[PDB]
Amino acid sequence: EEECCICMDGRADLILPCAHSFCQKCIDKWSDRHRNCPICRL
Ligand SMILES: [Zn+2]
Ligand SMILES: [Zn+2]
How was this structure determined? It was done by NMR
d(CA 31, ligand 2 centre) in Å: 15
Q: What CATH code is carried by the domain that includes residue 8?
A: 3.30.40.10
Partners of 15 in the β-ladder = 21
Rounded CA-CA distance 11/33 in Å is 22
DSSP H helix total and E strand total for the chain: 2, 0
- Nearest Cα neighbor of 37 from 15, 11, 10 is 15
d(CA 41, ligand 2 centre) in Å: 8
Neighbours of 36 (CB within 10 A): 13
User: Could you tell me how far CA 15 lies from the centroid of its own chain?
Assistant: 7
Query: How many structural domains compose the chain?
Result: 1
Domain carrying residue 41: 1-42
d(CA 6, ligand 1 centre) in Å: 5
